[PDB]
RNA sequence: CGUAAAGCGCACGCAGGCGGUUUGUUAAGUCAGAUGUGAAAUCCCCGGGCUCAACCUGGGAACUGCAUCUGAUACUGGCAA
């Protein structure tokens, strides 16, 4: 479970004493994750995490920014789970009710989109429908074929997702947060010390995790 | 000094039978309960915080016909006692003599019950007793004197007592027409819908 | 009982490996959330 | 076995370009008798809006109490905005006897023969929260004996 | 200037407790080990340590149960101001029984319950709730 | 007691209040017990008599105090280092 690897921790800039436990910190003015702590910290959360996703659970990544995506979508999409990749919705999973209808219109105006009647009577309309097609396929492109609201959500930075964080805390959803030294472990269930932008990280953390999900009982 | 009214409007306003004409009839059939109170009887009235402790208050002395200072120091009599208040101030209006005259079914109500008790026809432990708030001590024989013995009302009141409960605390026996209050009554063992926290919040208030 | 780990001396060796003084020893107080239940 | 009831409405204003505009305030507390006491505030532009709002968020976020036998613990005072509270076992002391809108929170959350006194402001909306806050941070004899070992 | 040393100590305590802090030192005395030794022994802090020779120093190892805090809420109650010393009838009960009320008596410094169980009473240190 | 009323314009300092830490002694405060007293009635508790109640009444508890004697010595005070 264990490879050498790089990333060695980041974030001189707007550090966060909560991080204070994770920390080796010495280098350049910036600080160092003791990797000692993350190794542990890691295996719990494949390990509750492989435990949910055995149970056949849903999962959310959540990768907003660049470059988690594709790599979010790589990795949610190498599973059979689901992702959020472009700007996370202020409530999308405590009023899901309302992100439903929209879901809804997303699947009903790619039905009318690819199969239906998508040149009928408007071309200039017929071209306003598919951009809300862009736009509802970025917004919620993971998250369309879901159905429920999930059963565990893997955040890849909890300062910069600290919205979906929070509302996974109101509704009792497990959170799985790579934090970084800025970050604060709010309410994340499983923290793991890391570091949330640098994609050679991500991939190998993504990676790991995706690994991880897809054995169920199989 | 006591109530001396329409006794159905009594129990109209409370919305429950506080079993003031047992009588001969059964169950009212001529009251019009819950209907009118009064003129605007009809309307809901919806009732407010003390309106709902004022109103069990009422409902139990309109029960047990009490009056206001004498029912406030059976409250307090009730408190300074040892246990539970509610159920230390029913123990206390339940063994006043007009009460355990109308249990063992020797007046058809509470009120028939407090003339024969009044009009000096019920004897305790031998001895003539007069007065309706005269308090029965457990292991008591109370029984009715030879005047006002095998009179109607007794006799009838006797006829609608197998029609009621039949109270565990009493013996009954309506043969020599005499009664023995055994025990003081359980909360469990009367009643069960009056709720006297209510009135232990409206008199601590 | 502890799980199956690198050896405290290869631990010690990743230490060595850390260039400069390279040790962080800050000492705070830890808490950890409660199990969640199997139910 | 859910047991709501609402405690305070109000009418509250706006003032907008064209004269003032009047809405309406409930505030429900619900609880099922036996600990597990919740409180919603809801506001709407009629009453009965407002006061399904408030018991719809009312049956959510509702909290655990670890109540004795029918009755709180220890004495405990719970404070909220200007709102200071005091509590007191009274160990069968007959009858919930509390401040209004202390009554409710108190009598839906299967509590029955408690002292109470309300401090400080009794604005409704503060005082619970205040008895929340209070029947929240009182805790059971083997809960301290869960923390202190024995 | 410090006029109550054991009012500092239980500050001590209530700021390491407010700060998830892991132990806590202070300079230390007789009463303060003694007090110290009451508060390991009703199970409120894990461990006390005092070092030093010439300057000694009271080190208390703080409890948490869970995330919380074991110590909830600990006051300083015959402070030098105005000393509160009760009888073995007065001698209080804190939390109904659920935190003990540290009371130095002619014996020792013991906790309310077992100075009313020792049948004497003394000078109320302080409440631990 | 920042802004609602409320920090002296700022200091020095007497009387006053409070006082780090260790050991020994005292035992004034503090605590424990005992004795004397704290009138009777009244309040409270358990009973008794007026048909009940009010009322009257038997016994106890109480009167949270003060004084003296006997002890304890952790804390505070006195004294010595």
């Given at each position: ?5 790089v ?16 920390i ?18 890691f ?19 959540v990768?907003?920014?660049?470059a ?13 789970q ?9 409530g ?6 309302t992100?439903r ?10 039905t ?19 951009r ?8 919620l492109?993971?998250i ?5 609201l999930?059963d565990?959500?893997?955040v ?17 959803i497990?959170?799985?947060?790579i934090?970084?030294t ?16 640098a ?6 953390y ?10 169920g009982?199989? | ?20 004409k ?13 209907q ?12 407010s ?7 069990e ?5 309109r ?5 206001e200072?004498?029912f ?13 208040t509610?159920?230390?101030?029913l ?10 005259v ?6 058809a ?5 407090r ?11 031998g ?14 024989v ?27 605390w ?5 043969g020599?027409?005499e009664?023995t ?5 359980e ?6 819908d009056?709720n ?5 919040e409206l008199?601590?208030? | ?9 290869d ?24 199990r969640?239940?199997?139910? | ?10 009418r ?14 409930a ?8 600990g ?9 532009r009629?009453?009965?809006?407002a ?6 968020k ?12 029918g009755?709180?613990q220890?004495?405990?005072?719970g ?14 002391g ?10 409710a929170?108190?009598?839906?959350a ?15 909306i503060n ?24 | ?17 407010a ?51 074991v ?11 105005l000393r509160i ?9 804190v939390m ?25 009473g003394?000078?109320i ?5």
């Amino acid at each position: 479970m264990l490879k050498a690897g790089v990333h060695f921790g980041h974030q001189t800039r707007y550090w966060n004493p909560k991080m204070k436990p994770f920390i080796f910190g010495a280098r350049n003015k910036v600080h160092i994750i003791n990797l000692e702590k993350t190794v542990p910290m890691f295996n719990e959360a494949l390990a509750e995490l492989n435990k949910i996703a055995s149970r056949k659970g849903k999962i959310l990544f959540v990768g907003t920014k660049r470059a988690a995506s594709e790599a979010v979508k790589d990795a949610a999409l190498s599973c059979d789970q689901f992702f959020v990749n472009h700007r996370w919705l202020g409530g999308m999973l405590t009023n899901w009710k309302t992100v439903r209808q929209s879901i809804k219109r997303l699947k009903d105006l790619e039905t009318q989109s690819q199969d239906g009647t998508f040149d009928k009577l408007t071309k200039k309309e017929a071209l306003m429908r598919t951009r809300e097609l862009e736009k509802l396929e970025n917004s919620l492109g993971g998250i369309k074929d879901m159905g429920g609201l999930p059963d565990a959500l893997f955040v890849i930075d909890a300062d910069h997702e600290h919205i979906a964080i929070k509302e996974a805390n109101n509704l009792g959803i497990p959170v799985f947060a790579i934090v970084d030294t800025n970050s604060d472990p709010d309410g994340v269930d499983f923290v793991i010390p890391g570091n949330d932008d640098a994609i050679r990280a991500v991939t190998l953390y993504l990676g790991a995790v995706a690994a991880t999900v897809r054995e169920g009982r199989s | 000094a006591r109530y001396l009214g329409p006794k159905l409007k009594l129990s109209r306003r409370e919305g429950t039978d506080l079993f003031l004409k047992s009588g001969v009839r059964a169950i009212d059939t001529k009251c019009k309960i819950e209907q009118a109170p009064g003129q605007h009887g009809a309307r809901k009235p919806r009732l407010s915080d003390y309106g709902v402790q004022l109103r069990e208050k009422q409902k139990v002395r309109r029960i047990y016909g009490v009056l206001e200072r004498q029912f406030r120091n059976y409250y307090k009599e009730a408190a300074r006692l040892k246990g539970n208040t509610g159920e230390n101030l029913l123990a206390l209006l339940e063994g006043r003599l007009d009460n355990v005259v109308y249990r063992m079914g020797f007046g058809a109500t509470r009120a028939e019950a407090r003339q024969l008790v009044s009009h000096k026809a019920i004897m305790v432990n031998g001895r003539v007793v007069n007065i309706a708030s005269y308090q029965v001590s457990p292991n008591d024989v109370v029984s009715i004197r030879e005047k006002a013995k095998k009179q109607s009302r007794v006799k009838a009141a006797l006829e609608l007592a197998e029609q009621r409960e039949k109270p565990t605390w009493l013996e009954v026996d309506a043969g020599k027409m005499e009664g023995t209050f055994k025990r003081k009554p359980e909360r469990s063992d009367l009643s069960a819908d009056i709720n006297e926290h209510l009135i232990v919040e409206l008199y601590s208030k | 009982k502890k799980k199956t780990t690198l050896s405290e001396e290869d631990q010690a060796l990743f230490r060595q490996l850390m260039a400069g003084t390279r040790k962080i020893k800050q000492d705070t107080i830890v808490h950890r959330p409660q199990r969640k239940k199997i139910s | 076995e859910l047991q709501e009831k609402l405690i305070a409405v109000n009418r509250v204003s706006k003032t907008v370009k064209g004269g003032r505009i009047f809405s309406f305030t409930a505030l429900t507390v619900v609880g099922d008798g036996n600990g597990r006491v919740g409180f919603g505030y809801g506001k709407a532009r009629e009453v009965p809006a407002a006061i399904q709002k408030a018991m719809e968020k009312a049956r959510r976020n509702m909290i655990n109490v670890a109540l004795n036998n029918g009755t709180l613990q220890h004495p405990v005072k719970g404070v909220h905005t200007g709102s200071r509270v005091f509590m007191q076992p009274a160990s069968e002391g007959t009858g919930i006897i509390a401040g209004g809108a202390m009554r409710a929170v108190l009598e839906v959350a299967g509590v029955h023969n408690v002292l109470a006194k309300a401090y400080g402001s009794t604005n409704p909306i503060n005082v619970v929260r205040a008895t929340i806050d209070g029947l929240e941070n009182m805790n059971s004899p083997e809960m301290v004996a869960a923390k202190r070992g024995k | 200037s410090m006029q109550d040393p054991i009012a500092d100590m239980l500050t001590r305590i209530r700021n390491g407790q407010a700060a998830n802090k892991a132990a806590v030192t202070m300079p230390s005395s007789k009463l303060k080990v003694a007090i110290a030794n009451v508060l390991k022994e009703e199970g409120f802090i894990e461990d006390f340590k005092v070092e030093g020779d010439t300057k000694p120093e009271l080190e208390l190892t703080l409890k948490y149960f869970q995330g919380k805090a074991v110590v909830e809420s600990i006051q300083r109650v015959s402070r030098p101001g105005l000393r509160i010393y009760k009888r073995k009838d007065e001698l209080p009960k804190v939390m109904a029984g659920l935190g003990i009320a540290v009371v130095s008596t002619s014996k020792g410094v013991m906790t309310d319950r077992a100075a009313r169980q020792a049948g004497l009473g003394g000078e109320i240190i302080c409440y631990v709730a």
